[PDB]
């Protein structure tokens, strides 16, 4: 879900 | 020449004093206002975003001709433009396509007149898919794929070690027209951190220029060119490195004072989070420095  | 050597010393000292770190951290990662990305956030579009926190702004998103399945013509992609000395450098920054968005990606390529794709990711990294394989494999028996109205043919491929150059042919099935598309995939980006081999990445930027050379057919050097399509997994970190690097090298042409944070600020106004880590930003400095050394 989240690009980190 | 002495002007380049002076600019090189200035770049090196900004790195030596740590000022490259300071200037990076004060650049906002996303727009303070008017960065709602309301179309990208629609429930009907959630399946079209690889990452829910990396989205295009409404004013600059790439709009597809709407279809019944895709009412807003949404694709996670942003128009990027920066003028250098009168020459508008045009780019489209997009995420790595998913299985459900390959048709959208190729429709985008067609409608925007794209002839060059810069893919700056491997397809899988760390056991996770980063980009669908949206173009066919080489080999006479299986080198074609159809995504909706577009049949794509892989025609040739060369491997240069840090990157590979694939020639594609794209056919609009409704009307029969064909266009050649070049696919330039950087394969040497490390799993963690940023590359230590500057030469390989510089040769990749040089190949992008060589493919611009192949595809330029307008006598007028000021005549407009279709945007370069740049994509990674989210279409922001390694994607921003390519775009900032190309613009900054073009700034080295004329006597324009180099202002890398200014240019990155303008880029981020057009797509959030471009150049997504500190090592990617220092990497741009190192690329510019190595570029000036090899002049």
Asked whether the beta carbons of B233 and B272 are under 8 A apart, the reply is no
Separation CA B84–CA B56 (nearest Å)? 24
Residue B278 sits at the chain A interface (C-beta within 8 Å): no
What is the structure's resolution, reported in angstroms to one decimal?
2.0
Partners of B179 in the beta sheet?
B170
Separation CA B9–CA B11 (nearest Å)? 5
Nearest to B125 by CA among B193, B209, B221: B193
Chain B residue closest to A2 (CA)? B51
Partners of B125 in the beta sheet?
B128
3-state class (DSSP) for residue B130: coil
Separation CA B80–CA B172 (nearest Å)? 26
Pairing of strands B228-231, B163-172: unpaired
CA distances from B212 to B16, B69, B183, B208 (A): 35, 34, 12, 6
Instruction: For residue B135, give every residue at least 6 positions away whose Cβ sits within 8 Å of its Cβ, in sequence order, or none.
Output: B145, B152, B154, B166, B168, B183
Asked whether the beta carbons of B106 and B171 are under 8 A apart, the reply is no
Chain A residue closest to B51 (CA)? A1
Asked whether the beta carbons of B252 and B291 are under 8 A apart, the reply is yes
User: What is the least distance, in Å, from the CA of A1 to any CA of chain B?
Assistant: 5
Chain B residue closest to A1 (CA)? B51
Give the domains, in start order, of chain B with CATH numbers: 2-216+226-293 (3.90.190.10)
3-state class (DSSP) for residue B213: helix
Asked whether the beta carbons of B167 and B152 are under 8 A apart, the reply is no
Asked whether the beta carbons of B119 and B131 are under 8 A apart, the reply is yes
Residue B52 sits at the chain A interface (C-beta within 8 Å): yes
User: What is the least distance, in Å, from the CA of A4 to any CA of chain B?
Assistant: 9
Distance of CA B64 to the CA centre of its chain: 19
Q: Residue holding tokens 């892989």?
A: B154
How does B201-232 read in b/e, with b if 16+ C-beta sit within 10 Å? bbbbbebbeebeeeeeeeeeeeeebebbbbbb
The three state secondary structure string of B65-124 is CCCCCCCCCCCCEEEEEEEECCEEEEEEEECCCCHHHHHHHHHHHHHCCCCEEEECCCCE
Nearest to B134 by CA among B98, B108, B168, B182: B98
Mutate to test the interface with B, among A1, A2, A3 (most CBs of B within 10 A): A3
- Chain B residues inside the 8 Å CB shell of A3: 50-51, 53-54, 233-234, 236-237, 273, 276
CB contact under 8 A, B54 and A1: no
Output the CA torsion B135→B136→B138→B142 (10° steps): -170
- Where chain A is discontinuous (C–N > 2.5 Å), the residues before each break are none
Nearest to B237 by CA among B86, B90, B48, B24: B24
Residue spans of alpha helices (H) in B175-270: 198-215, 237-251, 260-270
Q: How was this structure determined?
A: X-ray
Among positive and negative, which fits the CA dihedral B215, B210, B236, B262? Answer: negative
In chain A, residues 1-4 whose CB comes closer than 8 Å to chain B: 1-3
Structure tokens belonging to residue B272: 């959030």
């Amino acid at each position: 879900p989240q690009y980190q | 020449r002495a002007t380049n050597d002076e600019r090189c010393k200035i770049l090196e000292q900004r790195l030596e004093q740590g000022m490259v770190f300071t200037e990076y951290e004060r650049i906002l990662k996303k727009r303070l206002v008017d960065g709602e990305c309301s179309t990208a956030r629609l429930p009907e579009n959630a399946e079209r975003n690889r990452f829910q926190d990396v989205l295009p702004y409404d004013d600059v998103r790439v709009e597809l001709v709407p279809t019944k399945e895709n009412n807003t013509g949404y694709i996670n992609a942003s128009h990027i433009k920066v003028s250098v000395s009168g020459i508008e450098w045009d780019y489209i920054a997009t995420q790595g396509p998913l299985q459900n968005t390959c048709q959208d990606f190729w429709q985008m390529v067609w409608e925007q007149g794209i002839a060059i794709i810069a893919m700056v990711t491997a397809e899988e990294e760390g056991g996770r898919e980063k980009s669908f394989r949206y173009w066919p494999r080489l080999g006479s028996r299986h080198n074609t794929v159809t995504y909706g109205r577009f049949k794509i043919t892989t025609r040739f491929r060369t491997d240069s070690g840090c990157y590979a150059t694939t020639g594609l042919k794209m056919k609009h099935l409704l009307t029969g027209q064909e266009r050649t598309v070049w696919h330039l995939q950087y394969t040497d980006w490390p799993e963690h951190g940023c590359p230590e081999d500057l030469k390989g990445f510089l040769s990749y930027l040089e190949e992008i220029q060589s493919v611009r050379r192949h595809t330029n057919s307008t006598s007028d050097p000021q005549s407009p060119n279709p945007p370069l399509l740049v994509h990674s997994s989210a279409g922001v970190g390694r994607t921003g490195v390519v775009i900032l690097s190309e613009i900054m090298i073009a700034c080295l042409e004329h006597n324009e004072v180099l202002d890398i944070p200014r240019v990155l600020d303008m880029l981020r106004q057009q797509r959030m989070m471009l150049v997504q880590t500190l090592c990617q930003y220092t990497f741009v400095y190192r690329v510019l420095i190595q570029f000036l050394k090899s002049s």
